[PDB]
Write a protein that binds this ligand. Structure first.
Ligand SMILES: NC(=O)c1ccc[n+]([C@@H]2O[C@H](COP(=O)([O-])OP(=O)(O)OC[C@H]3O[C@@H](n4cnc5c(N)ncnc54)[C@H](O)[C@@H]3O)[C@@H](O)[C@H]2O)c1
Ligand SMILES: NC(=O)c1ccc[n+]([C@@H]2O[C@H](COP(=O)([O-])OP(=O)(O)OC[C@H]3O[C@@H](n4cnc5c(N)ncnc54)[C@H](O)[C@@H]3O)[C@@H](O)[C@H]2O)c1
Ligand SMILES: NC(=O)c1ccc[n+]([C@@H]2O[C@H](COP(=O)([O-])OP(=O)(O)OC[C@H]3O[C@@H](n4cnc5c(N)ncnc54)[C@H](O)[C@@H]3O)[C@@H](O)[C@H]2O)c1
Ligand SMILES: NC(=O)c1ccc[n+]([C@@H]2O[C@H](COP(=O)([O-])OP(=O)(O)OC[C@H]3O[C@@H](n4cnc5c(N)ncnc54)[C@H](O)[C@@H]3O)[C@@H](O)[C@H]2O)c1
Lengths: 336, 336, 336, 336
């Protein structure tokens, strides 16, 4: 009754997903594929700048490493169609490299003696179901071969936008996420391999504007909001931890207290609520996908009409990963 | 016809104001007051983490220091009433400590052996004239005893909001400034003397939400926008350099290109225009009070109505200081 | 038989000491004195940028706050003579403000309605007993009224220097500690109240040389090394976490392996040993006072004589605090 | 009388070398080769996080870009033997990619219709002359096909070690350089493509120990010191700017003043001298290869013998680049 999982890309999301999977019964990781040797991967699992020391033992072995005595095979195949996942019983692959985040590319894992299903740890295109756990995981039926866990920002934005929309009716909106720098930025100014003149700049030494598709693509998660939102990011020098601001007009006039109460009423394991005046370091490592912050709510009313601002925190690392593993765990129970 | 100026508070703004005044003919600094000895102040003028080495020579002397051979007297009086500005011929004081930023407090400089006029390098309350150079410096007549150079954020916001309002009619708006950390934050978590639970946190290690009065108080500079705007800040880990986002509804529907063209048409020495995809380090040390970034403009249109987003950069240090010294120079020329 | 403790200065060391005392049976904190209101102190206990969320509940009350339901009284007296420690049963005060770190100043806590004994959380001069737990806590007899827990650097240096000296005989040495920035540095360039032209500079944006008395003062802990060592610091942009390098000449020639084996043989709960290639974030929050890093050992031999380099990590916050509370617990158990 | 130069690798050193070459008469850059398009390279030349805006105009064109109206060809050939340098008149190549830093690899530029000589902007192996300008550029005769400009640390260490050795006789020494992070570190924890478990860690969020060969290889520059020194690095979170500490024993006993005077006597355009208590931001952009800091000198004397500590600053970017371009300019005059 345990589904065997493989991780392609033992990066920030891959390693934290591995960490969370150590505390759930329904799945286990039997194989990791990356581009390096087992000693590099074992060391990066054991020691983690932002998420702390690993909870357990890690011992490098020939061809893999042992976690609390259990051997995990490590391979270094650059091409997914060359990974023989089935040899190690792997049925579902977490595709966490950032290089195969579309249906046709992720399908490369599904070859003979490969895997059966793929969860992309990122937006995966419009022909792949895009799931924010506890907002729209109802759309899965288990027959899908490739699904998407969406982005960090989408998992933050979606429960907040859904709750506000259901209560008051979102007409239109603009989003800004103030976001930690990530591994797709350069450590120091240099050529960006994706052509982005702003991610080319030193990520820990600048406020860096950058594009994000979370608001424009929200219809994959909340169909009623298709075509109603847009937004962007300001990437700033913290190594993890982020926040999403959303400014909207609504069908109903509201008060600050009414907004905050509507968010609290929607709170659950994915969507948290706080009235404490926290800062970004306080959400590093949290398990909420989105933490609504009532201290930042604003309503600007002039001449009987309002602009409404709502703000939610997210650890783009652990908040996203908690949501990803919730979706993986659910998908594994229904996969067919 | 050269007006003698004193600086109270030889801090970030005080020292950079001194630097800019070295290239102005109409004013000269003859006296500095702070809380320390001349060697400390001379060293901090010569060496500057974010704004570079001083352009000239600085040499400590008895009771002050020489800048390019010219002696500047230094005193260390905590109470402005005890500063004998008149001994050094000072007529106008730049009040840059952060502790006397209101009319009655700034008037402490005005006494028999004191000065004649004060420019507060900060918001100064609603009963003193508040000037953003090249937006409303025509409200000065030279008879004022205390004026305000507004805040960094106000000098960024004002030319952008005025150009947008004049062209299209701002109905209501919300502002977020993503702002460099400043000296009123704690270097590491600890009790904040002002009672602010967020400025208590380590400023170079967090995204820190905090309040800002610039949007609400814009009516002191643009009277037609009184009651129309509000906003807040996200303080982030860069030691200087900031950006202001403004989301509004307007009386007229517009396009992105129409907005950008209206901003460019309003550009001058205070309000710059760029289409280059810059980041915060690129505006450190600039002399614009506000640098509009056309790459960040957005229009979100639903059902015939729009949200409009406009964004402008500012070096909260040198951009503000350039505006402050423009205002000081003008005020001194017409002073009576 | 539980000794009641007060904390003067609920700062980085004061708050982390409180956290560690929650897991010690022999002492309990009944009173905190600082300069602010209880809401500020409660918030700073609950949320901590570098050391994570508090393990328990914290709730503000009238005149203090409750920790896991237990009320802690809070006062705000700037002068230690005015703190009525005895009202709350306090016998031993942790003097953690940084402003009373000498015998006569710490004695201000000792009066009719005050405390009985003081532990200074810092060097306290050459006339108070200076204790590094598990190196020289046997010098205490419990009759002392004022003792010192030494500095962070001393607690790192002492077990390493003692093991090396006992095995091989230290003749002379120089120390460099590459140290996290601390609260006595300015967040941005500005006048330093202590007159230090380098701690005046932006602490999270520079490599900052600064003085350290730990090596010169080591004779208070290891008398045989009086007059043999000196050193200095390079303060760098991490908010906590530090490392001590020591270069010596010895009475005996040695090999790298011989040095490392001597360190490992001396390891205990205070002095750890590692061969993993860790970085500073890996020691944040550790409970060793000193963690020897065998990967950094060097022997430079020319013409039959050697320079020897040994290196040990320390979290200047939690490593020091773990040592401080070990000493407090021991001192309270034998106090008379 | 102008020698035409090509740059392979328009990175930190490549772009800053280009910037410095704009102010010297004897050489000009006619071709840049990297891995990207001209718009990326032009943008990175124009805007520079740590070294400021480019002094001039940059305009992208087809197949290259214009600098102050002069067209520079850009190509994107991954393999040096495929670059037809001679088509653009290039005689000397600055090999600044980091991927061809050995004689056999650098020689790939010297094929038919290629270049004539290569200067590696890094250590290049022991069969390549290794030059620190104004310390040993006398060893060049111009017949060499491949030479090395050494490392940043070597250019800092060498004039200081030479002056100390000539004056007093270095017996043995150990070096620690506290160094800015560089582009060979990961922005966030992840697999390091060189296998380095410490450069795998987030470079702007850690104190990172790492190896350096500058001390052990000093004999390539100062033959008398072969086999007498060793050392290592602590890489810390500043984006440029570094410092080198050296601890030695000498043939003569000395005083602090005697050491400082010997360094000042050796000062020139490459080796500067200061007594000001500066920090790392103060040496960003300087043109000295090495800036001796008299405030950090120490002499630890016990029982008639001494340990001696000397310390010099360097901008690992511009200090190294100034030295590199001095060597290039000299080599171009004598190349045959
Ligand atoms: N970091 C975040 O905040 C975050 C949040 C949500 C989603 N994501 C998404 O998750 C994915 C991974 O991001 P990350 O931050 O963990 O990146 P990362 O760079 O830390 O990890 C990528 C890993 O993939 C490996 N890799 C690269 N190419 C490979 C190949 N061909 N085969 C096997 N392994 C390969 C790398 O060696 C590395 O270990 C991306 O799609 C990203 O958009 C990231
Ligand atoms: N830094 C910015 O981005 C910025 C921008 C615009 C306006 N301002 C405003 O300018 C003022 C100064 O800000 P700053 O960032 O330069 O602060 P700062 O802390 O760098 O400088 C304040 C200076 O005042 C001195 N000082 C304090 N109390 C004093 C007293 N009683 N008498 C004499 N000197 C005293 C301090 O020693 C220090 O040198 C504030 O009102 C601030 O709001 C700051
Ligand atoms: N942070 C470290 O790495 C470290 C390590 C070892 C020792 N120490 C020592 O511990 C002491 C505290 O250092 P810290 O880093 O915790 O400093 P901190 O600035 O974080 O804390 C000092 C606290 O004392 C309070 N305070 C100041 N003056 C006071 C007064 N007159 N009465 C009551 N409270 C007052 C402040 O409000 C603050 O909460 C210093 O002696 C320091 O040298 C610090
Ligand atoms: N940054 C420093 O402090 C410093 C100091 C002294 C020496 N160096 C040395 O200079 C060299 C460059 O270092 P950097 O910091 O400028 O690195 P960098 O990463 O900034 O620049 C390397 C450049 O080379 C390009 N490149 C990579 N492979 C290539 C190929 N096959 N063909 C063409 N171009 C290619 C990259 O796109 C990039 O623009 C290294 O050898 C380094 O050790 C660096």
């Amino acid at each position: 009754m345990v589904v065997k999982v493989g991780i392609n890309g033992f990066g920030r999301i891959g390693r934290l997903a591995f960490r969370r999977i150590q505390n759930i019964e329904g799945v286990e990781v039997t194989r990791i594929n990356d581009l390096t040797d087992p000693n590099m991967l074992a060391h990066l699992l054991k020691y983690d700048t932002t998420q702390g020391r690993f909870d357990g033992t890690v011992e490098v072995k020939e061809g893999g490493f042992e976690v609390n005595g259990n051997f995990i095979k490590v391979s270094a195949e650059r091409d997914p169609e060359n990974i023989d996942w089935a040899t190690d019983g792997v049925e579902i692959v977490l595709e966490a490299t950032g290089f195969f985040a579309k249906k046709e590319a992720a399908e490369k894992h599904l070859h003979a003696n490969g895997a059966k299903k793929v969860v992309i740890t990122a937006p995966g295109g419009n022909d792949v179901k895009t799931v924010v756990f506890n907002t729209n995981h109802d759309i899965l039926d288990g027959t899908e071969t490739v699904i998407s866990g969406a982005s960090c920002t989408t998992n933050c934005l979606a429960p907040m936008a859904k709750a506000l929309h259901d209560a008051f009716g979102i007409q239109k909106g603009l989003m800004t996420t103030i976001h930690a720098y990530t591994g797709d930025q350069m450590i120091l100014d240099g050529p960006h391999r994706g052509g982005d003149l702003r991610r080319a700049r030193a990520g820990a030494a600048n406020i860096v504007p950058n594009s994000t598709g979370a608001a424009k693509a929200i219809g994959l998660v909340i169909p009623e909001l298709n075509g109603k939102l847009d937004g962007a990011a300001q990437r700033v020098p913290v190594p993890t931890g982020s926040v999403t601001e959303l400014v909207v007009t609504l069908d109903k006039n509201v008060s600050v207290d009414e907004i905050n109460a509507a968010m609290k009423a929607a709170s659950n394991d994915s969507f948290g609520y706080t009235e404490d005046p926290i800062v970004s370091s306080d959400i590093v490592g949290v398990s909420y996908g989105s933490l609504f912050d009532a201290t930042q709510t604003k309503v600007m009313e002039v001449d009987g009409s309002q602009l409404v601002k709502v703000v939610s925190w997210y650890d783009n690392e652990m908040s996203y990963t908690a949501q990803l593993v919730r979706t993986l765990e659910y998908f594994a129970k229904i996969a067919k």
